[PDB]
Protein backbone atom coordinates (compact mmCIF):
# COMPACT_ATOMS: atom_id res chain seq x y z
CA UNK A 1 0.00 0.00 0.00
CA UNK A 2 1.00 3.39 -0.67
CA UNK A 3 -0.23 5.45 1.63
CA UNK A 4 -1.45 9.41 0.46
CA UNK A 5 0.69 12.33 2.53
CA UNK A 6 -1.53 13.62 5.02
CA UNK A 7 -3.41 10.07 5.55
CA UNK A 8 0.17 8.99 6.44
CA UNK A 9 0.36 11.89 8.99
CA UNK A 10 -3.25 11.28 10.27
CA UNK A 11 -2.35 7.68 11.09
CA UNK A 12 1.23 8.40 12.50
CA UNK A 13 0.17 10.95 14.96
CA UNK A 14 -3.01 8.73 15.68
CA UNK A 15 0.00 5.83 16.46
CA UNK A 16 1.66 8.11 18.96
CA UNK A 17 4.18 9.50 16.25
CA UNK A 18 4.07 12.68 16.89
CA UNK A 19 7.15 14.30 19.14
CA UNK A 20 7.83 10.81 20.09
CA UNK A 21 11.42 11.07 21.59
CA UNK A 22 11.47 14.30 20.72
CA UNK A 23 11.13 13.84 16.71
CA UNK A 24 8.46 16.06 15.47
CA UNK A 25 5.71 14.54 12.96
CA UNK A 26 7.20 16.01 9.54
CA UNK A 27 10.11 14.67 10.51
CA UNK A 28 9.18 11.08 10.34
CA UNK A 29 6.82 12.23 7.31
CA UNK A 30 10.46 13.40 5.62
CA UNK A 31 12.25 10.52 6.08
CA UNK A 32 9.03 7.99 5.34
CA UNK A 33 9.28 9.84 1.48
CA UNK A 34 12.72 9.24 1.29
CA UNK A 35 12.49 6.34 2.58
CA UNK A 36 9.76 4.21 0.76
CA UNK A 37 7.67 6.91 -0.92
CA UNK A 38 5.22 5.47 1.26
CA UNK A 39 4.96 2.18 0.20
CA UNK A 40 4.68 -0.75 2.51
CA UNK A 41 5.95 -3.42 0.69
CA UNK A 42 9.29 -1.52 -0.34
CA UNK A 43 12.12 -4.17 -0.26
CA UNK A 44 15.73 -3.13 -0.69
CA UNK A 45 18.38 -5.58 -0.55
CA UNK A 46 22.60 -4.91 0.16
CA UNK A 47 24.39 -7.61 -1.65
CA UNK A 48 27.12 -6.63 0.24
CA UNK A 49 26.08 -6.91 3.89
CA UNK A 50 23.64 -9.95 2.86
CA UNK A 51 20.43 -8.10 4.59
CA UNK A 52 17.19 -6.44 3.22
CA UNK A 53 15.35 -3.15 4.00
CA UNK A 54 11.99 -3.77 4.59
CA UNK A 55 8.58 -1.62 4.23
CA UNK A 56 7.99 2.57 4.56
CA UNK A 57 10.60 2.75 7.47
CA UNK A 58 12.56 0.65 5.28
CA UNK A 59 14.15 -1.32 8.16
CA UNK A 60 16.84 -3.21 8.51
CA UNK A 61 17.06 -7.39 8.50
CA UNK A 62 20.28 -7.90 10.36
CA UNK A 63 19.41 -5.85 13.91
CA UNK A 64 16.30 -5.08 14.03
CA UNK A 65 13.80 -7.82 12.21
CA UNK A 66 13.92 -11.27 11.17
CA UNK A 67 13.43 -12.92 7.61
CA UNK A 68 15.58 -16.14 8.57
CA UNK A 69 17.93 -15.80 5.67
CA UNK A 70 19.96 -12.91 7.20
CA UNK A 71 23.78 -13.64 8.38
CA UNK A 72 24.04 -12.94 11.75
CA UNK A 73 20.51 -11.45 12.48
CA UNK A 74 20.04 -10.17 16.19
CA UNK A 75 15.81 -9.48 15.77
CA UNK A 76 15.95 -6.35 18.39
CA UNK A 77 12.33 -5.41 17.07
CA UNK A 78 11.49 -9.32 17.83
CA UNK A 79 9.58 -8.83 14.76
CA UNK A 80 9.13 -11.17 11.78
CA UNK A 81 10.20 -9.15 8.50
CA UNK A 82 6.65 -9.92 7.17
CA UNK A 83 5.38 -8.33 9.95
CA UNK A 84 6.46 -4.79 8.30
CA UNK A 85 5.43 -5.35 4.86
CA UNK A 86 1.57 -5.19 5.99
CA UNK A 87 -0.83 -2.54 4.64
CA UNK A 88 -0.97 -1.59 8.27
CA UNK A 89 1.52 0.39 9.66
CA UNK A 90 1.21 -0.53 13.48
CA UNK A 91 3.86 -3.02 13.84
CA UNK A 92 6.82 -1.26 11.42
CA UNK A 93 5.28 1.72 13.80
CA UNK A 94 6.53 -0.01 17.18
CA UNK A 95 10.05 -1.36 15.60
CA UNK A 96 10.48 2.02 14.42
CA UNK A 97 10.10 3.26 17.75
CA UNK A 98 12.73 1.02 19.07
CA UNK A 99 15.11 1.98 16.58
CA UNK A 100 15.03 5.61 17.70
CA UNK A 101 15.40 4.35 21.38
CA UNK A 102 19.11 3.12 20.52
CA UNK A 103 22.14 5.20 20.94
CA UNK A 104 21.73 7.32 17.38
CA UNK A 105 18.19 7.76 17.29
CA UNK A 106 16.88 9.24 14.04
CA UNK A 107 20.65 8.64 12.47
CA UNK A 108 20.22 5.54 12.14
CA UNK A 109 17.68 6.32 8.72
CA UNK A 110 20.45 7.38 6.34
CA UNK A 111 17.65 8.73 3.94
CA UNK A 112 16.48 11.43 6.97
CA UNK A 113 20.00 12.12 7.25
CA UNK A 114 20.87 13.36 3.54
CA UNK A 115 17.56 14.93 2.26
CA UNK A 116 15.64 15.97 5.88
CA UNK A 117 18.65 17.35 8.47
CA UNK A 118 18.77 20.69 8.78
CA UNK A 119 15.87 21.51 6.49
CA UNK A 120 12.68 22.71 6.62
CA UNK A 121 10.48 20.09 6.04
CA UNK A 122 7.04 21.45 7.26
CA UNK A 123 5.50 21.12 3.68
CA UNK A 124 5.35 17.32 4.39
CA UNK A 125 2.57 18.00 7.26
CA UNK A 126 0.70 20.98 5.78
CA UNK A 127 -2.95 20.89 4.89
CA UNK A 128 -3.08 17.39 6.48
CA UNK A 129 -4.93 18.23 9.72
CA UNK A 130 -2.48 17.60 12.13
C1 LIG B 1 20.91 0.83 8.77
O1 LIG B 1 22.11 0.08 8.78
C2 LIG B 1 23.03 0.60 9.73
C3 LIG B 1 24.34 -0.07 9.47
O2 LIG B 1 24.70 0.09 8.10
C4 LIG B 1 22.48 0.45 11.14
O3 LIG B 1 23.36 1.14 12.03
C5 LIG B 1 23.81 0.49 13.15
O4 LIG B 1 22.76 0.54 14.11
C6 LIG B 1 23.09 -0.06 15.39
C7 LIG B 1 21.95 0.33 16.32
O5 LIG B 1 21.46 1.64 16.02
C8 LIG B 1 24.45 0.47 15.95
O6 LIG B 1 24.88 -0.32 17.05
C9 LIG B 1 25.53 0.45 14.89
O7 LIG B 1 26.71 1.05 15.41
C10 LIG B 1 25.02 1.22 13.68
N1 LIG B 1 26.03 1.33 12.64
C11 LIG B 1 26.27 2.51 12.07
C12 LIG B 1 27.35 2.55 11.00
O8 LIG B 1 25.64 3.53 12.38
C13 LIG B 1 21.08 1.08 11.22
O9 LIG B 1 20.49 0.78 12.49
C14 LIG B 1 20.16 0.63 10.07
N2 LIG B 1 18.94 1.43 10.02
C15 LIG B 1 17.75 0.88 9.79
C16 LIG B 1 16.56 1.81 9.75
O10 LIG B 1 17.60 -0.33 9.64
Same mark, same amino acid.
Given at each position: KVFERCELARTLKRLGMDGYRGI??????????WESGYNTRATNYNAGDRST??? *??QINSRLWCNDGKTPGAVNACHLSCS?????? *?ADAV??????? @????? *? @?????? @?? @????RDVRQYVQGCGV
Amino acid at each position: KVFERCELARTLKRLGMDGYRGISLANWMCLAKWESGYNTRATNYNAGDRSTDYG *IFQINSRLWCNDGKTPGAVNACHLSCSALLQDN *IADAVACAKRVV @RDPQG *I @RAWVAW @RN @RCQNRDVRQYVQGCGV
